[PDB]
Design an enzyme around this catalytic site. Structure first.
Site, PDB file in Angstrom:
ATOM      1  N   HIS A 162       0.845  -1.200   0.000  1.00  0.00           N
ATOM      2  CA  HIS A 162       0.000   0.000   0.000  1.00  0.00           C
ATOM      3  C   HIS A 162       0.884   1.254   0.000  1.00  0.00           C
ATOM      4  CE1 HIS A 162      -3.876   2.188   0.976  1.00  0.00           C
ATOM      5  NE2 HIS A 162      -4.158   1.436  -0.132  1.00  0.00           N
ATOM      6  N   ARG A 189     -15.706   5.804  17.852  1.00  0.00           N
ATOM      7  CA  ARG A 189     -15.787   5.610  16.411  1.00  0.00           C
ATOM      8  C   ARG A 189     -16.429   4.244  16.127  1.00  0.00           C
ATOM      9  NH1 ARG A 189     -11.038   4.799  18.311  1.00  0.00           N
ATOM     10  NH2 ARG A 189      -9.554   3.306  17.421  1.00  0.00           N
ATOM     11  N   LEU A 190     -16.996   4.161  14.934  1.00  0.00           N
ATOM     12  CA  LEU A 190     -17.294   2.877  14.323  1.00  0.00           C
ATOM     13  C   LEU A 190     -15.977   2.334  13.806  1.00  0.00           C
ATOM     14  CD1 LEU A 190     -20.509   3.394  12.213  1.00  0.00           C
ATOM     15  CD2 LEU A 190     -20.240   2.624  14.598  1.00  0.00           C
ATOM     16  N   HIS A 209     -10.204   6.737   6.625  1.00  0.00           N
ATOM     17  CA  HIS A 209      -8.875   6.565   6.090  1.00  0.00           C
ATOM     18  C   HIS A 209      -8.243   7.955   6.062  1.00  0.00           C
ATOM     19  CE1 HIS A 209      -6.456   3.270   3.798  1.00  0.00           C
ATOM     20  NE2 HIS A 209      -5.602   4.185   4.252  1.00  0.00           N
ATOM     21  N   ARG A 211     -10.090  -2.141  -1.608  1.00  0.00           N
ATOM     22  CA  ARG A 211      -9.812  -3.453  -1.008  1.00  0.00           C
ATOM     23  C   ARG A 211     -11.035  -3.909  -0.212  1.00  0.00           C
ATOM     24  NH1 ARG A 211      -4.496  -1.569   2.066  1.00  0.00           N
ATOM     25  NH2 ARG A 211      -6.108  -0.019   2.609  1.00  0.00           N
ATOM     26  N   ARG A 252     -18.883  13.355   5.458  1.00  0.00           N
ATOM     27  CA  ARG A 252     -17.623  13.806   6.081  1.00  0.00           C
ATOM     28  C   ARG A 252     -16.389  13.093   5.493  1.00  0.00           C
ATOM     29  NH1 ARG A 252     -19.844  12.966  12.056  1.00  0.00           N
ATOM     30  NH2 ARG A 252     -21.589  11.996  10.930  1.00  0.00           N
ATOM     31  N   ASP A 298      -9.958  -2.932   6.728  1.00  0.00           N
ATOM     32  CA  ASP A 298     -10.144  -3.691   7.946  1.00  0.00           C
ATOM     33  C   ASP A 298     -11.590  -3.694   8.461  1.00  0.00           C
ATOM     34  OD1 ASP A 298     -10.090  -1.067   8.984  1.00  0.00           O
ATOM     35  OD2 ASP A 298      -8.230  -1.388  10.151  1.00  0.00           O
TER      36      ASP A 298
END
Lengths: 370, 370
Positions: free
Chosen positions: A179, A247-248, A253, A262, A300, A307
């Site tokens: 990555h 957070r969820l 990212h 991915r 947002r 993941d």
């Protein structure tokens, strides 16, 4: 003289390995779309592409598949160490220590890519022995007649997997191979820049990848799905989290400003898994969380990351959640090592500076006056 | 976008630990001149200063000296591993692995400085067990009544050292404890920035420091003086080296553009060492290399660095040449861990970028068509 803390938007190398299109949610390995490699390619063919820069011929790939398959065995010292530590040690600590031992044990000179091939072949053997040991099961030695992903599942289960399970693992590993410039790849490159050996580089990669802030290399989202328990509880669980400013997991990212490609691919390939009732439930949960997350956080620029689905896919195939960071490493070692090989074509020591805050020229105060 | 390859003159953190004056050849630890610390301080006091941010009282130093002395022992599993690997294995790979094992066994939470103290106390024991094993000598266990540097020489030699020898080692170690954002410290910080554990950081520091463009250079400088063989051959050897565009080992620095203060102090203290005929010869060679190097390369800011005299000093004190990078690490671990502790007061992930120079949008050709 301007601080560049975190090296945000500081380019440390040129690359032809991996391009990330953060805006549009695209990812390329040596110019090939990750979508096409996931559709049509396989673990060994992409490892060839990343290391040698071109797609292999039939003969080249046959030779290369053999070379990997015949390098999968681990030393007695390493296997004994894993048995000793599997049940008590952090699996990333075990992997850090065994790759360090592998390097110590390899007295050959040069041959970066040959050492990369050894590490890539052997890491699954180590991971599998951790898993088997934890379950009070016997080591299943690698079977060099099997391809990489088929063998990996064979070593966990002790029987050959279905072709559909193999394919899902194969794609999930290709998706993790590189990555571009994350913290772990940077650790590898700092070490390589001193002309330290490739095992030392990879040991530093593993050391960085362990950390929970690296990104990607955790099963936090899977834990969330398991805590939700039932699909009907998704809205309530998410409400408890968002209301309290938690957070969820699996969202966000620093890089993609849309669905991580991915993640899109894993979600598609997850359909091809046969699922027991637990896995089906957990996928229903994940899909509902994804739907709510995208409605709330989408505007947002906060979208599912790789993941979100990776931990659930690896769990579905029979790995313990806390092995997931090791499995990430098992694929990312290819990118790490490709990046080091590329950099070393024109090496430069990485040696930054600090901004100093404080007085200089303080008088040494003898101890009896303090 | 600009390629900042090597991170020359990029500041990655604010620091109060070490200030380097590259133009005037000055070096400070928490604002105290390295010259004053060499003159009047000691290993334990400087370690205290670096970790805790102030010079200790008598009581504080006494307690801290005891705390270090009490933590020098290593577990039987670690000593067994060292004894098994010491004859054939690279010493830095052994040390990398043992620190990795220490971390695996210490799953306790937080206490960064406590863990740093443990690593700093145990590393000399490991180094000493390597050297004793290689020479087919019985291990000499640490003596908790002895201070750090006296104990180190006692474990290597199997005999209590002179106070003069002790002082030369103690000073030599102080000189290596920190040097701002060198490549090994940067490796440690990249790893720490992911919120990986402190042992992972130090394992990455060792991995970097090994390389011959970093801490590995100290072995290479002594090897250079041995290759020259005679003082009479210095001029011929050096001129050919420079004609051919090969580097003089232990010359140059990313920051110093004058004589490294650490080199000046090592050269001064080296005078107190008793020298057999081999050692006297190598010092004559080194001194002549220094003179011709300064004359030619000093004109463009390339001067002796810490690695120029360190190896010869360690060799003269009875350490095997292969061990010099491990002895570097035995001191630098204090600075690495201090840097990590400082950074983590306000952590930021270190995540740089690459500039992409490859191809995009290549059509995937299936293997039968290649």
């Amino acid at each position: 003289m301007e601080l560049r803390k975190g090296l945000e938007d500081i380019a440390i190398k040129e690359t032809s390995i991996t391009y990330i299109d953060g805006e549009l949610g695209r990812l390329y390995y040596r110019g090939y779309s990750i979508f096409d490699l996931a559709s049509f390619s396989n673990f060994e063919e992409v490892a060839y592409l990343l290391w040698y820069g071109k797609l292999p011929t039939r003969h080249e790939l046959d030779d290369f598949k053999s070379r990997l398959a015949e390098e999968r065995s681990i030393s007695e010292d390493i296997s004994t160490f894993v048995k000793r530590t599997a049940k008590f040690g952090n699996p990333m600590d075990i992997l850090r220590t065994t790759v360090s031992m592998m390097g110590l044990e390899d007295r050959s000179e040069g041959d970066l890519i040959g050492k990369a091939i050894k590490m890539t072949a052997k890491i699954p053997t180590i991971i599998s022995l951790i898993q088997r040991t934890r379950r009070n099961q016997e080591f299943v030695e690698p079977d060099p007649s099997l391809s990489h992903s088929e063998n990996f599942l064979y070593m966990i289960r002790g029987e050959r997997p279905s072709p559909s399970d193999t394919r899902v693992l194969d794609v999930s590993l290709m998706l993790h191979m590189d990555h571009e410039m994350n913290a772990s790849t940077m650790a590898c490159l700092v070490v390589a820049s001193t002309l330290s050996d490739i095992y030392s580089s990879v040991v530093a990669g593993i050391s960085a990848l362990k950390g929970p802030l690296h990104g990607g290399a955790n099963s936090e989202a899977l834990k969330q799905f398991m805590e939700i328990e039932t699909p009907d509880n998704v809205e309530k669980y998410v409400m408890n989290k968002l209301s309290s400013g938690q957070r969820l997991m699996g969202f966000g990212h620093r890089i993609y400003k849309t669905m991580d490609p991915r993640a899109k691919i894993l979600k598609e390939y997850a359909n091809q898994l046969s699922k027991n009732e637990e896995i089906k439930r957990l996928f229903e949960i994940a899909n509902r969380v994804e739907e709510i997350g995208i409605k709330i956080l989408g505007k947002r620029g906060i979208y599912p990351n790789v993941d979100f689905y990776s931990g659930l896919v690896f769990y579905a195939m029979g790995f313990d959640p806390d092995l997931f960071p090791t499995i990430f490493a098992s694929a990312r070692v290819i990118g790490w090592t490709a990046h080091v090989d590329e950099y070393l074509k024109d090496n430069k020591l990485i040696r930054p500076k600090a901004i100093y805050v404080g007085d200089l020229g303080k008088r040494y105060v003898p101890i009896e006056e303090r």
